[PDB]
Every structure is written in C-alpha cells, then in structure tokens.
Amino acid sequence: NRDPASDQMKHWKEQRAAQKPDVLTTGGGNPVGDKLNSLTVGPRGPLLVQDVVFTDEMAHFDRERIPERVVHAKGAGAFGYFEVTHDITRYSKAKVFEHIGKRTPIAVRFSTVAGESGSADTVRDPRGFAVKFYTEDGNWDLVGNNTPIFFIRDALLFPSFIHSQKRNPQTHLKDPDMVWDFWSLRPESLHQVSFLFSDRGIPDGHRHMNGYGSHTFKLVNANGEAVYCKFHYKTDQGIKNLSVEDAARLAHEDPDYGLRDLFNAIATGNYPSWTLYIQVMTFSEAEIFPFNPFDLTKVWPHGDYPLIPVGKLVLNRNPVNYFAEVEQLAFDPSNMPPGIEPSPDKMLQGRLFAYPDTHRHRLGPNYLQIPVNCPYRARVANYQRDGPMCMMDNQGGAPNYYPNSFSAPEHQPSALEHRTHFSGDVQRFNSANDDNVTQVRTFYLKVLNEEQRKRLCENIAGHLKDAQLFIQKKAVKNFSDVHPEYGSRIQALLDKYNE
Amino acid sequence: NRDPASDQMKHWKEQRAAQKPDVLTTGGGNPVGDKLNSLTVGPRGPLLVQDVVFTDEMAHFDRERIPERVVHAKGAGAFGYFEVTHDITRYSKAKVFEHIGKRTPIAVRFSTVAGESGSADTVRDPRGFAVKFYTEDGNWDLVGNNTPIFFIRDALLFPSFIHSQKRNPQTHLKDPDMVWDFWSLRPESLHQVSFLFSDRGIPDGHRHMNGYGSHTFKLVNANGEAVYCKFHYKTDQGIKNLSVEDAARLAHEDPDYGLRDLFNAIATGNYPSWTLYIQVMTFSEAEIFPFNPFDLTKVWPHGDYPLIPVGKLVLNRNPVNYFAEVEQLAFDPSNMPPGIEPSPDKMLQGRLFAYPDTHRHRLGPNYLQIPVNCPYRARVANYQRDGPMCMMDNQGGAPNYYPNSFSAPEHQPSALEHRTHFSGDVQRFNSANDDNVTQVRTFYLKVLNEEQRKRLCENIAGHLKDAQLFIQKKAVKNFSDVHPEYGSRIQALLDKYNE
Amino acid sequence: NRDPASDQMKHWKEQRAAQKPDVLTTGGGNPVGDKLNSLTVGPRGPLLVQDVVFTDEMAHFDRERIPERVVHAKGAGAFGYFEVTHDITRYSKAKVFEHIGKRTPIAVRFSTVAGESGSADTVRDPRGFAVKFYTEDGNWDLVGNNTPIFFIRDALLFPSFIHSQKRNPQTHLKDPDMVWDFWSLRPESLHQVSFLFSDRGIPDGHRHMNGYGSHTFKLVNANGEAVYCKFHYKTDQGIKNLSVEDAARLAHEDPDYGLRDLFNAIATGNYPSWTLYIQVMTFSEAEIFPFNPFDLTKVWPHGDYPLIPVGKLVLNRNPVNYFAEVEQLAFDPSNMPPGIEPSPDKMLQGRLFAYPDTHRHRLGPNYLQIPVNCPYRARVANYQRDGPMCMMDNQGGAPNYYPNSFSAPEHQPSALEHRTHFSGDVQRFNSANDDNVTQVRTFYLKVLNEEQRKRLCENIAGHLKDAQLFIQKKAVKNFSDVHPEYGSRIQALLDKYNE
Amino acid sequence: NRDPASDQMKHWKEQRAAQKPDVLTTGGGNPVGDKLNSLTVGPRGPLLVQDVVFTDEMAHFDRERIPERVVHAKGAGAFGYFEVTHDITRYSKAKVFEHIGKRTPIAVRFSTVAGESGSADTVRDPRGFAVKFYTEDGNWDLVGNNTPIFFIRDALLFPSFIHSQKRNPQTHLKDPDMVWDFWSLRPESLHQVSFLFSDRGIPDGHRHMNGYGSHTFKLVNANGEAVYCKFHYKTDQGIKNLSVEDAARLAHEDPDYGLRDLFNAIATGNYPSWTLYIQVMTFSEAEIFPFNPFDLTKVWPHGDYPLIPVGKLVLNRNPVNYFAEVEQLAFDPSNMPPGIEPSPDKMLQGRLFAYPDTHRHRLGPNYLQIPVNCPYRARVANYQRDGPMCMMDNQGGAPNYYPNSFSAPEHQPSALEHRTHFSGDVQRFNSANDDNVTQVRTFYLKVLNEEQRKRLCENIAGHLKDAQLFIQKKAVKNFSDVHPEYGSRIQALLDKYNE
Ligand code: HEM
Ligand SMILES: [N]
Ligand SMILES: [N]
Ligand SMILES: [N]
Ligand SMILES: [N]
C-alpha cells in the first residue's frame, strides 16, 4: 500500500465493493451499448452522424476546459470549519463571531501566483490563502496571502505588475528585464520584495505558512461603533520553508508537492490548523499612525498593535472532485456580512470590483449558483433573475421588482453600512512617494538575522543578475536607499555574477 | 377577479399568507440595508465602488439575456404526463411503452418559427410542438411540428430556408423576394407551402392543433425486429383555426395569445390532451413505397398505413418560472432511448447533430444539467467531466477513463443499435427532383374543398404579390405543375393585385 | 418600382452587373462541390461525419444568435456626421468642438425600450437615440433618449423598473399590476409617465423626435474651468407623432415601420438631421437651483437656461449589414473625451458601469475591436492584452507593463479630469422624496393644452384600468398630488372602464 | 548583449528610433491623464465608480484568459513557407502541389500533450507538429505528431485515454494506476508506447524531430483517380533527443526550453526545415495489405511503400505576439482542399468533428475570422452569417440563402469529393484485437538496437513501478506478448523496484 492520494481509485473501488457498476449512459441518460467502438458502415467504412454516443461524449470532452484564474492559477483546496475561541463582539457584530465555540463551515484554496495551471508548487512566489466562511449572514470571503503586505499600493498598477511577473508578450518566456524594470521603477515594492526573497519565499507546502488578510479592514459592533483591523491566521504546525535547492528538485520530481502534501495530511487525520487573530486600530489611532494605515505596503507593528485571539481554522475534509469543488471555487473580497467592511485601502477598493467581475467571465454570470460558491447557510432572496445556466427555480414566480405590494423580499436597515465622513478633492492623488523604505529597513535589520540576510541577498542577486545593467543599477540604488549594506551586499554578488 | 394569468402576483402573495417577507440579500447571501438608495459621498456626491450591493445587482441585470433559439424563438411551455393506453410492444421495446397504464412525465414547448422573442403568436407559420419524455432509459425528445411534412428534404438547405424566411441582411426587414425566390427555386416545398397557406397555417392557440414527429423513425422490439414508423399526436380539443382577420387583430391586441390561452386553460383545470398514434411500415413495404419513404416532403397515406393508438399526452402543470423551465428548455432529436431509432431521412440525420450543437452554444456545454433538461428519471453515469458551470458533484471521484479495473460504469449490450444494411457509393445524391407535385395534387384536390382552395390561393397571392414579377411567374409555374387551376387561380389574383 | 428597402437584393444584383458569382466555400476557404445535397452511402443511406461542408455550415447557423440588448432590444441604425456650426470652446475643449465646420463621423441607433427583438416599432415607449462620435480623442458616446428626463433618480431602482416594464416571471405576459404597482409606489416617475402617455409617447418613426442627453454633464475648457450642461438635439424634420389608432394598425401591418422609414429616407437622399444645442449652468447656479440639478426627473427651465447652438447631426448612410453594424453597436456613456465629463447624477453614475459591463457579456470582452465599435479616428495604445477573439496584432511585442523603461505608451497630464470638491458622510441618502410633483404640474398645465390633457388621461386610464383597484387608487392619488384635476379626470375614466 | 529572446524588449525599444511614445488611452481611445493613481475623494478616501480608466483596464485584465487547449496545451509556434521541390501531380491535384517552386505560406505549432499551459517542455510525451498551409483553395491543416502512429485506433477511446494521461479527478495528481490500467487493458497501445518510452520520447527541442500526418489520407488527381497516402516530414536538422537526466534538469532549469530554442534559432537566421515526403498505396494494395491500412497503430513498411519527395517546410518568422498568433492558432484536420481527402481511419473520422467543435468553444463561433486562422490566400464566400464577435462586414448585403436568383456565390462541381463504394451493416465493429503485437515486435527487435532496448525497458519500468502490482502484471503480460524478452527485462526491473 502507498499514500492515500495514490490509492484514490483503489479506495473508491473498495468503498463500493459488492455493488454492481452503474449502467454507462449518454448525457441525456440513454444507456450505451458499446462505448468502445464507433458506429460505421462496415468494419472499414466511414463514421456516421447517427453515432450520437460519440458526438455526445466527444462534444463534452471538447468543452472540458474553462479559463484558468488570471492570477493564482495553480492551487490546492480543502474544507473544514472555523471555530470561535475568543470573544471579539466588542469590535464586530458579525454572526460568524457571535459566541465562543460557534462553528462555521469554511472552504480554503492555497496557490502560487504567476505560474499557469501546469506550473510547479515549490517555486519562489507569494502564496494565496483564501478562506470562504459560509455564514448565516451570507458568505464572507477572506481572500488573503501568506504575507501581511503587497508589492504595490494602488490597483491601477496591478495589471502591469502581474504582466511583468508573467510571460513576455512575444517570446512567451519569463523575462527578468520585465520583472526588475517594474520593481526598480516602483520602489514601493521593496518591502514585499524583501519578504518574497527571504526564506518565507518558498513555504514547505501550504500547511507551514501563515495567512493574512493583508489589507486594513473595518469592524462594526452592535452599537454602531467601528474600528479598523488586520486579520492574521498563524499556522499551528509551525513555519517551515524549503531550501532553494530542495525546491528546485521538487519542482521537477513533484510539481504538485503542495497538492499531495495537503491531501495526505487530511487523509491521514493530520488536520492542519491556524489560529485567527486581529489587530485593532481605533479611528483616532489611524489618524496618527506613522504611515498611511491603509497603505498595503505597510504592516502594523505588533508592539503597538498586539494580536487579539479570535478562533481556529481547521481543514478536515478533502475535495471529492477537484474541478467542481476547487477549480470552480470563487472568492470575492466584496462578500462581507454585516459587522465587517472595507477600509479606504486603494488596493482593497479595486478588489471589491475585480473578483466578482473576473468570476462572471471565468465561471459564468451565475457562478454563485455553483454548489461550492452558494451561500448555503443563508437564504438568498432578491430581485435578480435569469442569466445563462440558470439553476434551481430562479426564485419561481416571486414578484421581480422592488418595491412592490406583493410581499416579496425586503431590505433590513440593521444591515446598513457604517457611516464614515469623507472630505476632499476628487482627484488622482500620487501615492508613489509614501515612504518606501522605513519598514523595509526594520525588516532587513531587525526582523531578519545575519544568516537570512545573506540568503536574501543571494536570492535577489541570483535573479536580478539576468536583467540589463542599467536595471541592476536602479534596483541596487533602491536597495541602498533601504540600507547601504543591503544594496552593497547585492552589488558585490552582482559584480561576481557579471563575471 | 380576472383570468388566472392576470392574477399571478395576487395569487403568489395570497399563497404567502401571513408569512413574513424574506430578507433581501446580495447574490452572496449578505443582507441588504437599503436597496433603493446608492452609496455616495454626500447627498449630491459621486457613486462609490464600495457600493457592492449596486454592482452585484446591476452586474446580474447586465447578464440576464441569453441568445434566443435560432428558430422557434417565440413560444410557450407546460408540463404533464404521457400514459400508455395500448400495447405496441410488438413494435418497440422502449420502456416508455412498457405497459398499459404506464405514466411518464413530459415537458412540452409550443412555438412559431421565424419570429423573434418579441413577435406575435397569431401569425401564419408552422408551429413547433416538442415533447420531452423523462424515461427510465433517459430522455426521449420527440421534437415535432403541427405538420407531418416540411418544406425541404435535405439539411444542407435548412440554413438557407430559415434565412429566406427571416430578415433581409441589410434592411432587417421581412423580404417577400427572399421568401418566394427560395420557394420558387425549390419546388419540393409545394406540399408544406400548400399546408401553410391553408386554414391550418394559423391555429387557434396551441391546444387546437395536431402534433407530428414528421420524420419516419425506426422502432425495434425485444426480438431485434425493426419496422419504420410515423408519430402522430392528435388534439383531443379538436382542430380550430383563426381567420386571417382575427389573427391580424390578435397580433396587436395580444401578441401573446397562445401563451395566455395555454396558461389559463391549465390554471382553470381545462387540461389539454392529445392522443398519440403511430403508422407502421415494414422494411419490405418501404422498399416498394411509391416515393422515398424517408422523404420529409411526403406523408404515408392512412388508407395504406392506418393509425395505431398508443397513448395520451396531458398537460396539467404550468411552469413556475418561465425563463428557467421554458426558455432554457432543450430538446434533442438525438435523445432516443433503446427501442426508438432514426431512419435514413437526410433531414432527420442532420437534426441529430444540430440541436445538441446549438444547445451547447445557446445554453452552455453543461445544458443537460439545467433542471428542466436533466434526465431525472434515469441515472446519468459516464466518463464525461468538467466543463463550465459544472453542477452537482461532477460524478465525484469515480474513475474517469473506460475501460478501467475499478468498477466504474459499464456499457450495456442490450442497448446496442439495430443492424441495418446499406450499400452504395459515398456521394451527394441529388434529391431535388424527387416528385414534388403528386401528393400536393392530392392535398389540393382531395384534402381541401372548394372554399378552402379559394382561401388557399387568396392567402398565397396576398403574400406572393409583393415579390418581383419574375419570381411570381416561376412561383405560379410550380403551382401549375401541381394543377393547372392551382396556378391559374393564383395568377388571376396576382393580376388583380398588380393592378 | 417599389421602395428602395424592398429592392435591396435587386440593387445588389444590379450592382454586381456582368460580374459572375464568386465560388461558394466553407468557412476555411475550401471550395464546395455541391452545397445542396448531403454526403451519404447510397441515395437512401446514412449521413456521414465526413460531410464537413454540412457540419461547417450548420455549426455556424447554430451559433448565429447573441443575447439581445437587455433593454432597447428593438432598433434601427444609420451613419453620418456631426458638423460644428457654433463656437462653444469657452465651455468645452473637446476636440470634437474644436472649430466651426469641423466634421466628425457618427453612428446612431434608435430604439424602443421594453419590447424584444421581434416586437413592433410603433408602440408607446420611450425611444433610445444613441450617438457615437468617432473623435480624435477617442469615441464619445452620447447615449440619449427622446425625452429629457427619466422615471427614476437612483440606479438601484433601474433593474426593478425594467422588470416591471417587461414580462411576468411566471406567465411571460405583460403585467399591468407590475407596471402600475411600481409606478404608484415610486411617485418620482410622474414626470416621465406624463410625457410617456402624452402624444410624444409614440413618435412617427425616428426622424420626427428630439434627442436628449437627459443627464446633466460637465464641460471643461482649456483653462481648466468647468460648467454643467445638458445636451439637446432637436429634429430638423419637426416633431410628429402617431395617433393611438394608427400606431396600433402599424403594429401588425408593419412592426418594422421605424426601420423601413429610416432606411428609405436615407436611400432616397432625404437625409434626416438634428440641431445640437446645450444648456449651461455654472457651479454657482447649481448650488442655487430650486431642485437637485443632478436629478434626472427634472429639466432645466429654458427661460433661465437658454438653448445654445453647437452643431448639426446628419444621417446620410444606411448600414450595409445590419447584424455587423447595428446589432453589434455598443454605446458606453463612460466613453467621454477630454473636455466632457460626468456629473454627480446618481443615474448617470450607475450607467458609467453598466454599459461596458453588459457589452462584455452581450458581445464579448474584446467588443471594442468590432469594427463599428472601434475608435478608428484615434490611436488605441495601452497595456491591455489578450482576451477571447483577440483581433489585429494585440499591440504586437510592445512592453505590456507600465511604467517601463522601453518607450511604450505614456499617459498625458493634459487629459487629467477636472478636480471638484466633495464633502459629507458616506451613506445611502434617500432621494425618494426630492419633489415629485412641482415640474409635473407645469408640464400638465403649461406644456400641454386642453385637448392634449384629454388624451393624456385617456391613454393613462386605458392602461391603468387593467391593474387591481388598490393599485388604481394609489396611482390616482399620485396624479391628484400633481393636480386634483389630473387625478379626477383619470378616475372618471377608470370608473367608466371598471364598468 | 544576450540571446535574442532575452533582448526582446531592448530590441523593440531601439527599433522605434527616437520616436515619441504613443499616447496611452482607454480601450475606447480616450487619452489617459494618470494611469498610476486611482480617482478617490481625498488622499485617503474611497475609490469612485467615476474612475472609468481603472474599470476599463481592470475589466479587460479580468478577461485576458481563455480556456487552454483540452490537449497539447503547452506549445510554441512559428511561421514560414512550404515549397514544392518535386512533381506529385499524378497523385494529387491540390493547388498546393501545382508546380515545382510553388510556395505556400505556413503556420506551425509544436507542443507536448498531457501537461497544462504552465508545464515543462522537456518531458516524456508525444509531440504535436501541426502545419497550416494557406492555399488558394482555402487552408489545409496537416495536424500531425512526431510519431507515425498513435495509442488507439477508435476515437471513442480518445477522451478516456487523455483522461488517463492527465490528473486524477479527486487529487488532481498524475496517476500511474490510471495511466497503466488503461494501457494494460488496451494493448493496441503497445506500438506507440514502445516509441514513446524509447529515446524518441524526449526530443531535443522542436527542430530535432520528424513530423507525421500519421493517418492514411486520400489523394485525388485531375483525372479523378485516387490513391491512399501517408505524409512524412523529416527534420533537416537531424534527429536529436535529450537524456532522461538532462530533460529532468531542464524541466526545472528552463520549463520553456522548446519555446526559447525555436525562437532563438529563427532570430539568429538558423531557420529549421523539414523535407515532406508521401507514401502511396493503391486501392488495390489496400485490399490486400496484411493489416488494416487505416489502423492508426500501424505503419506502412518503407520497403513496400517508399518515401516520395514532395517539398520543403521552412520556418523563418517568429510570432510578434504569442497570444494572438500562437495561443489562438486553430488547426482543423477537416480543412482539406480539393485533391486531399480523408480515409476511413476511425480516428481521423472522429477528428473531422472534434477540432472545429472545440475551437468554437475555446476561441469562439467565428474563430476562423481571427487573423492567424483566416484563409487569407483564399476568397471566403458563402451563406454563413452573424455569430458573436462578427468581424469584417459579415459579407455585407449579399443574398444570404442558396439557391437564389441574385448572383450570390455558387458551388463548383469540380470540387466534388472522390466517390468510394461501401457495403456493410451500420454497426459498432470491434477493432480492439486487430493485431496488437506484430509490428511492435519488429520495432523492438529490428528497429531498435540493444542499447536503446535497454533504455526502453528502464524508462517503462521506471514509470510502471508506481502502479499497483496487478496492473504491473497485466502490463508485463502484454509486453511479453510482443516478445518474451520484452516483458522479461521489464519484470526484472520491476522486481528490483518493488524491493
Ligand atoms: C441607471 C440607469 C440606467 C442603466 C443602469 C441603464 C442600462 C442599460 C443597459 C444595460 C442597456 C443595454 C446596452 C447594450 O446591451 O448595448 C441600455 C441601453 C440603452 N439605454 Fe440605458 N440605462 C439606464 C438609463 C438610461 C437613460 C436615462 C437613458 C437615456 C438618457 C438610456 C438610454 C439607453 C439607450 C439609448 C440604450 C440603447 C443603446 C443602443 O442603441 O445600443 N438608458 N441601458
Ligand atoms: N492577486
Ligand atoms: N426547425
Ligand atoms: N436604458
Ligand atoms: N490529440
């Protein structure tokens, strides 16, 4: 016997023992007589249109693929539950946090970022760590990453950043010039770049990394009082990373290392868990925070904003069919129940639009009707109707316009969003110069130790060496701005590489 | 009180009784605080991206429409059952005919042909009468019309015929030149044209017309013996047509006369029914039939092939949501259970491909998963997987390749198709000159009487008069070939029209 | 002969002259031997998969349809130019107004609102009048209607309104209860409802109605100074409407009356034209305006805001292929060149999102690449790439990320939007009670005379009579609020109808 | 100065002289003022819907992806020409072979089979080698592989085979049980499996492998005489393969080795070329051939059917934009011009349907209108119209029905297909046992030498060892059926592996 993953079919057959195999049918339910030989006129004659068994099956095979995610295409999923362990109702009225011990089903998908569906798991890249909470007040999607920060602070640079990280438009090859030209021209990326090229750049699977909402969010309590927060979910199995050489080897020996590791852990009862925490910042504190508290390239120092325990995230169930339950999973940051709201973070603001938008394209207009995406713990009732692939009863014969005098769904004022006051000129404010080095300097000098600082520079140099000289110069210049020793170490390695 | 249809919302509300209205939510299940006022900065300020209630609802509104059927776009639907009244098991082993008293759920859609979704019901045009039988051996779709024949006998002319019956590619207007240039060039259309311009061209709603499979099909019994057949389902409400005047009036007074009539009939308990019969022709008789027995422009004389009773079709349930149960309804002639097979009819052969093909486009790759199209009386099990908008569990973790040693679905020999022999060259055999007038003459002289022929010619002339003279000449010539008087009577009317 | 539209093919044929017919080919360009007879084994044998001429043609026929517009599905289009006649550069720097005599090609689509693609042209309903200006600074889409106002003032009520104006979700029938329950519950609709049921409710074709931008927009001059404006394009052919009796007759006699009328006018050289004017309101006046100047249910009194001439719109070219040039036409209000910007109008704000969004669904992600939608008078250069049905060269091998050090496209600071200041809480401000009767009373008393008021009430009562009594009561109450006589006259008619 | 691929942007930059970069615009051609900062209310305020620069760009980014090819997803493309070097007009009248020296432009795509878009190039797998010839008689797509044979001989097993070669439906991992259970149950796969696991399984890039049409095709000359044939295009660069070790290293060192290799070869003027040959078998010989001449698992012995020189295939132009010219490339085996036709090969017959079918899905209904797929050397003229994303003029106002009296396109009888006679019952004839070992034995003992036989078995055992013992057993029995020593050697290796 081998690992559970390897024995998937062996186990399927066993848990069905004795049962006679089902009758093979066409999509329309018609039994098939012989699905191994085509219908022709004579043994060596032409294929007939009358062979509807062939066409029915072949037409579906021809339509199996859907567009992969534009970003985070390579991933793994699992299911489990969220359990409240601490009371934070003084900050949020969200039903999901209602009482200690309360359980809410969750769906989770882990992923890399730049690689396509056939890429390797063990490569340097941030890691997606999305969590869907099926709450009574609808779904709450906490679409986080394995890092508290990100490369940029304005959504307008996101398509460009992603493009720079992917393939050259003409050669279809990874392009270090594209990667470093963008990063060198946008130094705000220094913080996450430093994290990315540190040991945390290649987690040992998905179970040995933390998750973060990254963005500053807003929590509102029953009294209508609001505070800003940060979500953190630390791994209970400990942080563990793969060395550059081990990652390269696994890259070809098992491009699906993360998928396999997660499935086997769950299959053997070694359920991975994370502890969910929040950092809280009052509106007054946000007004005096040393940096823009809504700047995604900044963290909230733990010393000034301690982590507050909330609950546990446990994954105890593997997908039964990957395509249906994982490939089709759709997380929308805009999916927020009462008690949880967005902050002015320019990046988060852009995401409120982007995810539902790309989902309507990738999956379809009615993607929220796909089982794994349906808020099955809530009661969906509204005035939306039709659309392609309309499932269920499409809300039957219920009045389809609001307001109406026929007892159809009514809005609930208690669900009204928290009112914040805003004043200012409507314009495109430049945020390109919002302190790009201070916290980066702290990370390099205080967070990292000597051994990791060494690896960090070697990691950066090893990749940056392939960019043109003028690009290497600008990049080094930015690293020197963070700390002269930082840029100096990289330059020395670069000089050597440039042989 | 008014008609049941008019009180649709009134009844829905009364049905709700004192039950409190559901909470209005977003597609993601999040309760909505105020869905009547957008989120802005100040009462006269800009709209915020942060208003995800607006975007969620509007995005779905923006995607409500799907392509209408390329033909038969305007229609009505209802549900009910099929009941076997006689034993025809000597001809077919199909489970749907298994035993007297046997009940099978059915779905039916009635429709016109050329008009778009907003067109009128009471216009001259054939009428679609498609019946979906949800059997244990999968769905059987008998996609019939209100006529036993059709305008052409080879599928390659179908797109052109439909094009000629629709809008001019430049002006987007109905075009008499297109309609009659095609018909005058393809005389095989004389039989159905004669039927179309007779009183039968405009039935009084959908309950007062017959249904026909039109094509010759093949039935196979338990002993493997086969016979060719024709399906006929006659209205138990009696044939009833609308005069040209009444139809024209209803066209603007009630473009949805057929829809309203059917819904009210069922709503008031006046369930419409049809008696299903079959005509049987042995392979020996097919060999000596005076015409090509598989020629869609020919009927099988009842005197030689009597109608044999089989059962009854009853519609006793209105759809609850039109879009979900009717607009998304998909009938595939290729959906035939064991015991029912296609004949060599070139037209039928072509339809075997066209319907599932257009359905994958109009509805989606997984259209057979839409509730109303699912063969819910059968167990769908096969090696097909994925595709956009994949519902249910996508057959879970079952082995997805055949053959396999893991107990997955197996084909069933008993479901093998009947063996028919064919010999000949592979070529495009011309059928354009396959007797286009004989049966038309019988129809004109025997089936119709004097007053009916008079109206027939008046109806033809009234439309043909708008076509160019050279087209009128050729058209009249064809009618003259059927019978000198047929043509002369039309020419006289034409001369009058052309002043 | 007959009208030019009827002779479309005749002319095409004559245009062909002595030229011989081209060779008929498959979509792949392969010459076809016989496209009138299918490939079979023997004259009465099975159809072969090998008949790829059949499949190629049928598969395309099966995919001819695309979803119709969610609203304004029934329409007609034409092309021509816009010519500046007056200098308004003091208000707007838009290149399209650059200098007197300057011409800019335009595309226009006229339409009804509620009816589907097969509905009749001459029915009571607003009329769409969209104009696309192909300017050097990109396309400017002025998506107007034949009315200066609308039924609602917040986009959140739009989907509901449209739903109430269309078919009952269960019966698929027009529903007076839906129509009037909505209007009676939303009194802000009184203004446009009065206009709709007035004689203007049914224009005589598209050439005899005015066009309006409806919304308040913003104009910005070269000095960066801004003013608010309203766009008005009055018909030079003069206002002309159809009586209720004539409209009903044309509804069945010629449902495409509007299409035909326009095509023939242009085909005979009787090019229809409109004079473009604008009303200008300074920001100072906007703050003093007695009503919300951004309220779509309000007009700007001509006495206080005189119509200022700008130019002329001329339609002198019919479409060659309707589907390609008209059905695929896409107008996005968000398509505004420098010099023209939106106002805070809550309705306009919503439209900024809805159109490009619905277009990505109805047509496709790359719909701006469809010839008629391409901004061919400008140079499209950006960092957008790929997507389905990607035409041209997809911008070749140009750097696809911004910023970059490789000379790819750069933004132009001069195109920056005008900066306005806004202050206030972020909330859903209720606008349901923003004076719903004042201007409606002036319309009823001044704009209309006695005979018109007579018809207005007859048309209203003629439709409202079919709604339930409790709905009739609410509606009348609203009319009475406008003017006691308005309501009492309708009630008198209703009492008679409810005979 | 690096390799040409790496300097793609550097070169794009310098080829624009000192030209001012283009103005960055929206998709609608509107100039952008600042595409680096979003529009908000105040420096730290919410994002506005009014920022249509953001939405336009983000919405397109959200739709960049299209489904990857269901198979052969990972590939590289290039363009060039085909030049006739010898006269084979006595066999085929195809215009592409008209006269010595005649050049026809071609498009080519190379690929692996099982791996997704992000997979590695240097892995064991067949190699796709599709060639599109843009001839005057339309496009001719010779969709070949780097092997003259395939694993199966009936299209009904194709979806299953591909499924077995891809990922487990539950774990999403490669599955050796799936791979070998299928192959062991279907020994017809022995021939191609032997080739696949030989050194030819991992070619050194795309330039060092042969191309094959694989299937038996039919050629028809000017006199209507027909012969069967096989296409062979041998590499002029010579056969060269990568060792298992090197391929593994490259798998992670450069997942895009094939892409880069081909691009640089062409960029440096080292244009790769292939010599096209054909084998000819008369209809008489096909009747006596010891195997089914249309059996895809069989080759035609060169000794009895020598290679006949035809012309040269040369690739001398790289794609400018990969997505537009390569990812969107569509090859349809059914695209055959007069002079070239299919044979009864059950696999080929199935492919006649599948490719256009999947293309309508993957790309869109009008995928033949995408530039790279358009038969631009031909004149497309037919009665096909509309469909989503309809480009050009949709054939303008030309009559859209056939036949017609208005001079629209007409079929050309000279393009009629060659007539073959067939006699037989319409049945599903078994081909599972059509000699699965004979040619495999000659390959093993005669085609390979001792050294490569050693490698063959090691490669097989190295993969087979991970499957369950019962599967290994069955697979070994099949190899033993080929030759006792074939199975013996593999079994010895398996024993060593299974400890
Ligand atoms: C918040 C309110 C509104 C929303 C959300 C909205 C939404 C829509 C949508 C989704 C379409 C279909 C577009 C297509 O498929 O091409 C449409 C069409 C149209 N709308 Fe609106 N609309 C609104 C208000 C109005 C108003 C006030 C006007 C006029 C000033 C207007 C004029 C039109 C016209 C003329 C068309 C048809 C354009 C064409 O001919 O292609 N709409 N609208
Ligand atoms: N992302
Ligand atoms: N049809
Ligand atoms: N609209
Ligand atoms: N393939």
Can you put this structure into words, describing what you see?
Four copies of one chain form a homotetramer. The first copy, chain A, is of the alpha+beta class and 499 residues long. Chain A has three domains: 65 residues, Cytochrome C Oxidase, Chain J (Irregular); 258 residues, Catalase core domain (Catalase HpII,  Chain A, domain 1); 115 residues, Hemocyanin, N-terminal domain (Up-down Bundle). Chain A is built from 14 helices and twelve strands. In chain A, strands 2, 3, 4, 5, 6, 7, 8, 9, 10 and 11 form a ten-stranded antiparallel sheet that branches. In chain A, a hairpin with a 2-residue loop joins β4 and β5. In chain A, α4 packs across α13. Chain A is globular, with a radius of gyration of 26 Å. Chains in contact: A-B, A-C, A-D, B-C, B-D, C-D. β1 of chain B pairs antiparallel with β12 of chain C. The site of one ammonia (NH3) has 2 residues of chain A, from loops. Chains A, B, C, D: One of its GO terms (molecular function) is heme binding. Chains A, B, C, D: It catalyses: 2 H2O2 = O2 + 2 H2O. Chains A, B, C, D: This is Catalase. Chains A, B, C, D: Its cofactor is heme; NADP(+).
